[PDB]
Amino acid sequence: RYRQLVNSSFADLQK
Amino acid sequence: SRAFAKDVKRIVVKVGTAVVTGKGGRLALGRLGAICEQLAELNSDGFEVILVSSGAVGLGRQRLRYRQLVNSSFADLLDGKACAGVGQSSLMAYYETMFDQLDVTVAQMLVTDSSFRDKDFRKQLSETVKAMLRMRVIPVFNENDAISTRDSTGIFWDNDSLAALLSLELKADLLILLSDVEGLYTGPPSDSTSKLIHTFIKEKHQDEITFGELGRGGMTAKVKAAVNAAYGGVPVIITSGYAAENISKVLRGLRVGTLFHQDA
Amino acid sequence: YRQLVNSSFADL
Amino acid sequence: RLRYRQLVNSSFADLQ
Ligand SMILES: Nc1ncnc2c1ncn2[C@@H]1O[C@H](COP(=O)(O)OP(=O)(O)O)[C@@H](O)[C@H]1O
Q: C or N: which end of chain C has fewer Cβ atoms within 10 Å?
């Protein structure tokens, strides 16, 4: 979790 | 047969969220384009078309999504009334921008549930639509989900029942509804026990066909709207929107889709 | 970092 | 413009 977002491109978070 | 097809003057076409919106809640620029292209071409032939749109919910939702995400913090670890506002803005934008490519002018006329109970509002709308659809102007109707609070008229008053009633009110014919399936299958399309029907007999079919299992609209409302419009005196044809050239074949004297007429 | 943790893509 | 385009595809770990 934390790590996932820690290393993600915001555009991705939109996924 | 399809003898009524050759002699229609005022045609109404309705597009649901199943066709206007594609994957990722993004306007299906493809289908939405091809169909509006063909509609502009058809209007350039002198016909009088009526457009009903249903994609406010989805586009709205996506846009709000983005706007929220743009302003969020670690939250990465919506009310329709707004979704619809933004969705309508966007849909109307696309329709216009796309229709300005063929010098076809469209005016957005929006109706609400608490408006069709008035005795003279129907007459006023009839006169204004008749006046507007004379200089090759295409009007666009859609349920105004923003102001909407909720029997009114039309069950669940989705765009299907709205289109059926509106075509029943204004003297017109050939109610065309665009879905993602190539007609009214007698059953679920996935199952092999499902065959397309050329026609529709009220007493033979309605009792025994069984179906059911898309924010705007919903099946089992389409059939009721079609039957209550056809028994009112307006022919109804159902055809898929995945091939926008289908409607041109409909309006030439060729048999595709399902029928709903006063005949038996 | 805690700052970045607390911001908006808009913020950046 | 292009800055926005990039940020969009950037990973938090790259904004440091
Ligand atoms: N009798 C049937 N024949 C074919 N398809 C059906 C039938 N009943 C339900 N469906 C499917 O159910 C779905 C419901 O969507 P529909 O209400 O038709 O469009 P929208 O949700 O845009 O109003 C349709 O996509 C359709 O394919």
A: N
